[PDB]
Chain length 504, copies 2
Amino acid sequence: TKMWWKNSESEQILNRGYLLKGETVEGAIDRICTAAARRLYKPELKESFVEMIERGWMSISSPVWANMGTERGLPISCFNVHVPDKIEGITHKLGEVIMQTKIGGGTSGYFGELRERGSASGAVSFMKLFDTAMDTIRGAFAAYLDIDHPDIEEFLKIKSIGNPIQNLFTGICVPDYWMQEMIDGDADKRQIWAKVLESRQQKGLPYIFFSDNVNKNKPQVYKDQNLRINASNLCSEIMLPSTHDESFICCLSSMNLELYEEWKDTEAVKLAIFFLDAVLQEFIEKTEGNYYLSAANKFAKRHRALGLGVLGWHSYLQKNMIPFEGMEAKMKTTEIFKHISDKADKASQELARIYGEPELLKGYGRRNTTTMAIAPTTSSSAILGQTSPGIEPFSSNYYKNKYLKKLLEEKGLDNEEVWRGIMLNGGSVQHMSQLTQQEKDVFKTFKEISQLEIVQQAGIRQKFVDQGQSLNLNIPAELAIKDVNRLMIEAWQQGVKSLYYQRS
Amino acid sequence: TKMWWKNSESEQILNRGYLLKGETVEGAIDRICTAAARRLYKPELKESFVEMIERGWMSISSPVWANMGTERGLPISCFNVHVPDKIEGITHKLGEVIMQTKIGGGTSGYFGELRERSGAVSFMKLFDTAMDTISGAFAAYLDIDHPDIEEFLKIKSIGNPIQNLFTGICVPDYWMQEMIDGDADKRQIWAKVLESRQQKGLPYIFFSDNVNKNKPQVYKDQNLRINASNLCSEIMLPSTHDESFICCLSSMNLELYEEWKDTEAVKLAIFFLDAVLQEFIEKTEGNYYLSAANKFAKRHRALGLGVLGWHSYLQKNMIPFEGMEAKMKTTEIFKHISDKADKASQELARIYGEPELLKGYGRRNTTTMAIAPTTSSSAILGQTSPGIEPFSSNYYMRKNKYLKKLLEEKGLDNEEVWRGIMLNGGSVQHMSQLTQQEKDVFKTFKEISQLEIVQQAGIRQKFVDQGQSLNLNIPAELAIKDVNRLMIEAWQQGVKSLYYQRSQ
């Protein structure tokens, strides 16, 4: 039913700059969908886009909420810059980041091309400029450096107590050759690797970018033109190439898997892709002339990369009494992601038939170099009935899990005593004698789930996503370091493109 | 005598970047003068330039040494940017400062147009971080009636996030007058300014109205406000959104004034500086980030002919720094030099025509004169006195040559008397062997009346179309009432700027 999700909790979230002054939620949706349909030259689709958002089938990112339909607002907030080895290029890209930040953007940069310290200052030294800019202009920037870069040891110290860089997030780009030589017993590399694992234990960072997994499994067109993906974005799910004159940019939205059964046999995915192509077009037309957004503008025009994701994956499982671990979720992963990716692919081909291929995709038959990417969706999930975030399982059942509630009522046990016990057991229900192993397994939390199973599921999911997926792992501190190491290796070997924060 | 000044001490200085690899001092002068004559289309002037430099009548900025006559080297090292109140503009000027720094320039900026608090000082932090990153010295200027003035005065204090920026405050007449007449808020601010100069030496003082009421008529007619000065506070030129002031520097040696006063030395010095500026213009055509500097040079052709060995020249003639005779000497010499410089700039207009700004004004350069610190210049030329500053000491391991000669003719050029001078901190005021007149001649900076220094600087300023780096020596001893009166006298007598406050 329409607007089922709009309550006091979601209204509060939306009042933090999702809505213009004097605007109702319904009014905002109408503003946004009117604009999307105008950019497609198809005002008839307006009501279909409205229905999708009102029914909560598709959530839209916050920059879309706030900016789409306004005269000057930019409805994208995901940028990356390639940072050249010359001071003039660094200076230009510092500008890009400054202006990208100003308009509300999340930002990121690849620094692997920069000279090491003592050459005819170093890569880390220049990251201080970007650090200061973040402190100056509520911004977020992720710096990416290769693991076989000479300044890696310096790079890993970022966000330590004492370290002059406190504002930058970090990710490291780890190629296959480096990984194998480390397994085969390279002592230099193992000490670096132990430092990485040590850093991720302590601070949650850096993110891991598996360079060869990313480039192995990217759109054919990027292989044919030899455009390398060197790094990811702030949340580590975007997998696009940035160059001296092209800064990658992506529009995000998510399909709500909790309501999969409602929308799976409609044109929902198709309209989501049409919608995202519209958002991109609005960005493109609004940034013609903007000096510092030129490289972003130019990427958008040539690639038209889209990033349609998901949320409520755990919620969908729990709604169907499928446990997160085991074979049934894996096969269901294959069912849903084969279905969505296929439909997203066809939508992109349809877009090419109507609007034509952009310059990079001439002869390739599709409008968008990429269609799908799975973002964290922390806010969209909360907006949309406190659904599970992205493809991440719920941390807790009580911090009150809707599908656990209804189960407990069926058994009679929906009382304050049971919930008090759940609270004392940290949101777990694994202590409860009144639940079968099957029921316990469905309502296991992030902690209690096998991290190995999460990685295996990620691997299967990745085959249907042309970009990446924000993948958090919850590894206790008490869990041995040798076992953390096996978990990384498994992720790498099963084709996982990246790892996000490490929780504990 | 040619190359009298070249010895072990002056060769040590020249061997830190003045000479190219495998170059002799004679060869460098030749490269420089050849270049300067080429740029004028007057190769016959070359040997005149060589004679002036070899004889040590004219000293040349260090940037001229290393760069003039090379293919790509920029023979300017003095820049200033106007920082606009829009972030795109702040980003562009940050760019300017980064590139200006890269090519070996000292830099400065006016920040007074920036809005109050993330605020003016928040954005200075970017420039601070650039200094600590790029292979440098920057002076940030703010008006004293800027709301963020209190934050600004904390720069370079224990704990402050800004440690690399030098600072200067711009002080209007109305503010000084209201402060004197008993505005309590003003006095509170003035006290912090004085306390800061006492404990740190900073900030510099820029007397906005003094600077602007006594600037070239062309700047009044075009309504071009000089908002700030340079790193060393002697350069008095307007910067705008699209013009960034630069000036080429060199100095007349006043020690050898008797030698060159009746030659065409000053004229030739002006020709040389115009040539240097032409070399800068031609090498920066097409440089994106030096574009605003290139435009300033093209349109204004501002020059900065200075002086050095002022004190030395006095001591050579047994003239005391204090008293009417030094005051009259200031008038005789600087009237002569300023009149020759004005006429040479007129002759340049006759030969090469007027730049855009000076159509109808009948000269080639908006300004001709400015007095720099000349710390390195004076050390090179037989350790003569810097700029218009008194020697700090008679023995610091250099002996004052005119003192040495005065003692020489009293059989007092022995280790005993010099040991006595060293024990008295370079002073001869303890010596009953000298008359009172002779003691007056050899007073040191801290022993000279700071009032007399200011009064002399006031008289000098009437003959200098820009400014003059004016250090004061204020002991901690001295009462804040007396320090205050000193600042007011300087202001009242038309002093444009005060540089460092020294605390011997």
